[PDB]
Amino acid sequence: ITTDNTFVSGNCDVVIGIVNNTVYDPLQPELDS
Amino acid sequence: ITTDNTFVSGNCDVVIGIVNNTVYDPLQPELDS
Amino acid sequence: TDEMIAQYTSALLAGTITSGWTFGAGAALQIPFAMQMAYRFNGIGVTQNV
Ligand SMILES: *[C@@H]1O[C@H](CO)[C@@H](O[C@@H]2O[C@H](CO)[C@@H](O)[C@H](O)[C@H]2NC(C)=O)[C@H](O)[C@H]1NC(C)=O
Ligand SMILES: *[C@@H]1O[C@H](CO)[C@@H](O[C@@H]2O[C@H](CO)[C@@H](O)[C@H](O)[C@H]2NC(C)=O)[C@H](O)[C@H]1NC(C)=O
Ligand SMILES: *[C@@H]1O[C@H](CO)[C@@H](O)[C@H](O)[C@H]1NC(C)=O
């Protein structure tokens, strides 16, 4: 689950049946340097 | 070939007729800062 | 007969709501109806998030 396959929209309220999870940021190792 | 409009899947032997060239990366300039 | 005609229509409806559109193409697949509707919105042109 990277941000390349996702588009954030709204918040965690209107959605029904959502699940908590983590979404990897593909920049963190590249941000470290 | 920007990495923005290109994506990766797997290794470099399963495919057929592949060629050799580095894919251009847009994250190099600003990472140098 | 009207009985098994209505049964055929019931099969059509059940496959449409539950299995998505796949049953007429391959094998029926359980898949949420809400997500099926979101996929249909993606089909028409509006993003499923709406
Ligand atoms: C997703 O995680 C968030 C984390 O903030 C959950 O929100 C709170 O989680 C804590 C866990 O200790 C609960 O005690 C609270 O009641 C939750 N709500 C609020 C308003 O604080 C959220 O519930 C989680 N959702 C799912 C579906 O797992
Ligand atoms: C692209 O380059 C790679 C690496 O040279 C080629 O794969 C083989 O890699 C091994 C180990 O690195 C080398 O010993 C071989 O000589 C490489 N094969 C060849 C034909 O050079 C890969 O074949 C190259 N692909 C193209 C289309 O030139
Ligand atoms: C493609 O065509 C070239 C030229 O005809 C040939 O040498 C080669 O073996 C063919 N196949 C691949 C995978 O390149």
Q: Which residues line ligand 2 at a C-beta cut-off of 6 Å?
A: B 19-20
Gap between the Cα atoms of B21 and B15, Å rounded = 15
Nearest CA to ligand 3 atom 11: B17
Output the CA–CA distances (angstroms, integers) from residue A6 to A2, B18, B31, in the order listed. 7, 29, 23
Q: Is A9–C34 a contact, with Cβ atoms under 8 angstroms apart?
A: no
Listed in sequence order, the residues at least 6 apart from A11 whose beta carbon sits closer than 8 Å to its beta carbon are none
Output the CA–CA distances (angstroms, integers) from residue C17 to A21, B12, C25, C42, in the order listed. 28, 42, 15, 17
* Solved with: cryo-EM
Helix, strand, coil in percent for chain A, rounding step 5: 25, 5, 70
Gap between the Cα atoms of B16 and B25, Å rounded = 24
State the resolution, in angstroms. Answer: 4.2
Chains B and C touch (3+ CB pairs under 8 A): no
Q: Where are the alpha helices (DSSP H) in B1-33?
A: 28-31
- Tallying the residues shown for chain C, one arrives at 50
Q: Which residues of A touch C34 (CB under 8 A)?
A: 16-17
Burial call C1-18: b when 16+ CB within 10 Å, e when fewer: eeeeeeeeeeeeeeeeee
Gap between the Cα atoms of C7 and C13, Å rounded = 10
Q: How far is A10 from chain B (nearest CA, A)?
A: 25
- Going by C-alpha positions, the residue among A18, B20, B28 that lies closest to residue C49 is A18
Listed in sequence order, the residues at least 6 apart from A9 whose beta carbon sits closer than 8 Å to its beta carbon are C47, C49
